[model samples]
Target: KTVVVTTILESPYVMMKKNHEMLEGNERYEGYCVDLAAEIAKHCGFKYKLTIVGDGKYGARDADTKIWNGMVGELVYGKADIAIAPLTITLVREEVIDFSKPFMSLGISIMIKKGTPIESAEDLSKQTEIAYGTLDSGSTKEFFRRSKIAVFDKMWTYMRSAEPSVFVRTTAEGVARVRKSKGKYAYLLESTMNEYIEQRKPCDTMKVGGNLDSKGYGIATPKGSSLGNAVNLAVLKLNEQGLLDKLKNKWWYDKGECGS
Candidate 1:
């Protein structure tokens, strides 16, 4: 039997082929984690199957009831053996499941239309001019929704009370909203993915400030999952061996345009 790995369709991580209408799994759904998960399995000595989460969202919570979503829901409900998406770890999540030893760490970066005064997350909470909210069901949203941090504690007040609930449903929506807002809207997103978007065409948005929060993403498992150790150790070994770096360079740096 193969370990069932959970992934998502976040850019620079996993993307469906532009011509996916003509391809299979080996072609259509492939990206950084696509190869990284496979390589990690090979190193850890395991068989696996990749299942992309049905929705493209990450983590979030209810305004009135407070519940999590995406990978959080998958792990909480035992839908998969492991979650390898760019799932950021938090003190709250740590109480519910186990996380690997941080395969990657990233800070929260605010994405705003070029020239927007919203340079840092601090600005979002301090001023009332710019309106911002994370993807409705994403980690960034939850970070503030469930946070005790002074800045975010106040920001959540704005989110739960936004007149139109001005939250984007996906990363693409957040980006597009920034483009169309002419500097009125902003996005709270992973710094790594934000950097990738910065290098792409048009470059209408920019990553500013020195990161709002610091956290690392790890493959999460249930509290007692035995495979956790090997998975954690394998990622560490792979990181040391430079495979992770090479994979990023190949995917983000070189693009899947090459016939590897």
Candidate 2:
């Protein structure tokens, strides 16, 4: 059977080619995860098809109903055989799905307009003049919602009640808000994405300060699925061979638009 792989469309990870409409099947898309998926299938010996998450979310459990949604939901409901995206591995998610060792390491970081005066989480927390937010339905939003740290806790409090709502439905929305806010808004997202965007055109945005926390992105499978073990081993082998690092350079810096 052809494996069904669930993923999301996020720049530098998964994106539509400029001439995507003229292409067919897998050729319609390209990026780090696109290449990684091909490599994984080759090692695991299976044919696969890529499908975007129907809800376009990173997977989160609802507080009221305890139902999983997004790519995680796809796995839980057997909608997809595996997920090969920049999906973070968290304790909550691990309880419901199996995750291979991290293929990429990252942490929450801030994206700001180039001239924004903010320097850190504390800086954003201290002033209300500059509004800040994170991508909704993601780990970053959950991080703030569950944080006990003083600054992050305070930020969550502000974001939860701010007028017009600080939460954005997607990373692109958050980045767009920062570029158009004229230094009045900052976006909190993963360091990898922040760095990637910094190197793209309209390079008016920058990632500031050190990462807020540490975590890794993993390939996920339905808990106890037959493919879990082989997929895990394949990821370990790939990392050992430096293929992951090579892919990072290929998609990130090699095609980067802004000068280093």
Candidate 3:
């Protein structure tokens, strides 16, 4: 079977090249995931189709339906054979799907408008003047909801009940809200995304403080798939050969215009 790879279009991880207008299908895209997918296919000896997730979401379990949506849904429901993206590995997600060894590691972080009064979680939880939120259906939101820490619990409460809906539907929406809020809003997201956005033009947002939690991104497969074993070994082989690090540089820093 031709493996169907479902993913999201995140920058430096998966994005169209400058001349993508002239490209076709998979050739229209490049980044960490694009390169990583190629490596995995090479080692696993399978042809694959790289398709963007239709709904443009990472993956979230719908509370009412008990159904998984987005990339996770694609894998769980057999719409896609594999997921190669910045998809984080979480216990809740792992229960229904299988994840290969994490190719990249990161943690949840705070995204603040440049010159915001906040410097850390302590600053956000102690005030009402500046608004904040996380992606409505992302792992970061779930993290805050389940955390036992006082500050995170307090934050989750504020966000869950905030008027005018501080919670956004996507990371780009969250980042845009922060940029336009004039220091009155902050966004909590993965540190990897925070760092990537900081290097973009305008550079109005900064990632403050250390990460709130540690995690890693993995290539996910539906449970009981034979391809799982081969994919896992391919990731390990790539890491051991330093190819993973090289791809990160190629997509992030070498072609970077921010001098990051």
Give the number of the best model, judged by lDDT.
2
lDDT of 2 at 25: 82
Instruction: Give the alpha carbon lDDT tens digit for every residue of 1-260 in model 1.
Output: 77888789877788887898998654677788888888878878888877788665555565677766777667777888888878777777778778888777788788887899877777888987788888787567777888888988998998889876678887788888888988988888788877677666686777888887788888888778888888889889988998888887776557633223
RMSD of candidate 3 to true structure, Å: 2.4
TM-score-wise, the better of 2 and 3 is 2
TM-score of 2: 0.89
lDDT (0-100) at residue 234 of candidate 2?
Answer: 94
Q: Which residue pairs in model 2 clash with each other?
A: none
Q: Score residue 92 of candidate 1 by CA lDDT.
A: 76
Across 62-86, the per-residue lDDT of candidate 2 in tens digits comes to: 9999999999999998899999999
Q: Which candidate number would show the highest TM-score if scored against the true structure?
A: 2
Error of 2 at 72 (Å): 1.7
Q: What is the overall TM-score of model 1 with all chains considered together?
A: 0.77
Give each model's whole-structure lDDT.
0.79, 0.93, 0.89
Per-model TM-score, in order, reads 0.77, 0.89, 0.87
Report the lDDT tens digits of candidate 3 across residue range 72-180: 9999999999999999898889999999999988998999989997888978998999999998875678888998999999998998999989899878899999999
Clashing pairs in 1: 59-138
